Design a protein around this ligand. Structure first.
Ligand SMILES: CC(C)c1cnn2c(NCc3ccccc3)cc(NC[C@H]3CCNC[C@@H]3O)nc12
Length: 287
C-alpha cells in the first residue's frame, strides 16, 4: 500500500520513512515498529488537534505495527541547529511555545500525557506551525532506556518527580519538559544536559536548588530521594535564561516548579502575560 520514498528518522520504537500512499497519492510519515498497546494506540486516532501530528492509520500486520502519520518537512532540533548562529527570533519562539501549549492543553484535557517531549518530537511546516509527534506512545509501550537502535533515550527534559521514582506521572511532566525546551530555544544550549539519572538530577538541583519539604511537600519520601543528596542553593533565572524578558522568565519559573501540583498548567500558561503580544511569524525554511 506504501511506496517508501526515503528513510527520515529513527523513533524510540522504530524506523520512520517518508512514504507515498499508492492509491490516494498522499505523502505520509510511516513508522514501522517490530494488545493493550493496540487498543491504546488505536484510541489516538481520535485525539486530533492542529498542534498534534495527525495519526492517519494504525495497521497491525505480520508481527509489525505501522503507524501512518501526517508528514512534516523539518524538526525543531534541525531548525535550532540551523539557527545556531543568530538563534530563533523571540517572536517565533513565543509563537512556537504558544502553539505547543495549545497542543498540551488539548491532550491533557483528554487525560493523555506525552511523557517524552524533546526537540526531536517537535516538527514544523512552512505555514509557521509546530506540532507534537509521538503523543500517547509512552503510555502504550513505556519509555525504554535505549531505542530500538540502542541509542540512549535522552534524560535532558525529564521531570524531577520521574527521576525520583514517582510512579504516577501527571500532566505536569509535559510542562516541565516543555519549559526545558523553551529555555533551550532562548539560550541555544540544553538547560540540563544530564548523562545519567543522577547527573540529570544534580544538574537540576544545582540550578533550581536541591528540593526540600519547604518547596516540595513529600519530596523526602520519594522512592529515590536520599538524605545524602548535596544541598545546593538556587540561582536567579536572570542568570539562567538571558536575555529572556521578565514575562518569559516568570512563565519559565512557573513551568519549572518542583512541586508538580504547583507547576503551571498548559491552560493557565496560555493566559500568562508573556503571550499578550504573541503573533504567527513564518520561519525561513531550506527544504
Ligand atoms: C512519524 C511522524 C511523527 C513524522 C512526520 N514527519 N516526520 C519527520 N519529518 C521531518 C523530516 C523530513 C524529511 C527528512 C528528515 C526529517 C521526521 C520524523 N522523524 C522520526 C521522529 C518521529 C517522532 N519522534 C522523533 C523521531 O525523530 N518523523 C516524522
Amino acid at each position: 500500500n506504501f511506496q517508501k520514498v526515503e528513510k527520515i528518522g529513527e523513533g524510540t520504537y522504530g524506523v520512520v520513512y517518508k512514504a507515498r500512499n499508492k492509491l490516494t497519492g498522499e505523502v505520509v510519515a510511516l513508522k514501522k515498529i517490530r494488545s493493550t498497546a493496540i487498543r491504546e494506540i488505536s484510541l489516538l486516532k481520535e485525539l486530533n488537534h492542529p498542534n498534534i501530528v495527525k495519526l492517519l492509520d494504525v495497521i497491525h500486520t505480520e508481527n509489525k505495527l505501522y503507524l501512518v502519520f501526517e508528514f512534516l518537512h523539518q524538526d525543531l532540533k534541525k531548525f535550532m541547529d540551523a539557527s545556531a548562529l543568530t538563534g530563533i527570533p523571540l517572536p517565533l519562539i513565543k509563537s512556537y511555545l504558544f502553539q505547543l501549549l495549545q497542543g498540551l492543553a488539548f491532550c491533557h484535557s483528554h487525560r493523555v500525557l506525552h511523557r517524552d517531549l524533546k526537540p526531536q518530537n517537535l516538527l514544523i511546516n512552512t505555514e509557521g506551525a509546530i506540532k507534537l509527534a509521538d503523543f500517547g506512545l509512552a503510555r502504550a509501550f513505556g519509555v525504554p532506556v535505549r531505542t530500538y537502535t540502542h541509542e540512549v533515550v535522552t534524560l535532558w527534559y525529564r521531570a524531577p518527580e520521574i527521576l525520583l521514582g514517582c510512579k504516577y506521572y501527571s500532566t505536569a511532566v509535559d510542562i516541565w519538559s516543555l519549559g526545558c525546551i523553551f529555555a533551550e530555544m532562548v539560550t541555544r544550549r540544553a538547560l540540563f544536559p544530564g548523562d545519567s539519572e543522577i547527573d540529570q538530577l544534580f544538574r537540576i538541583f544545582r540550578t533550581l536548588g536541591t528540593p526540600d519539604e519547604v518547596v516540595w511537600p513529600g519530596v523526602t519520601s520519594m522512592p529515590d530521594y536520599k538524605p545524602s543528596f548535596p544541598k545546593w542553593a538556587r540561582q536567579d533565572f536572570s542568570k539562567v535564561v538571558p536575555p529572556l524578558d521578565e514575562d518569559g522568565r516568570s512563565l519559565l519559573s512557573q513551568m519549572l516548579h518542583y512541586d508538580p501540583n504547583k507547576r503551571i498548567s498548559a491552560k493557565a500558561a496560555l493566559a500568562h502575560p508573556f503571550f499578550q503580544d504573541v503573533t504567527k511569524p513564518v520561519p525561513h525554511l531550506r527544504l
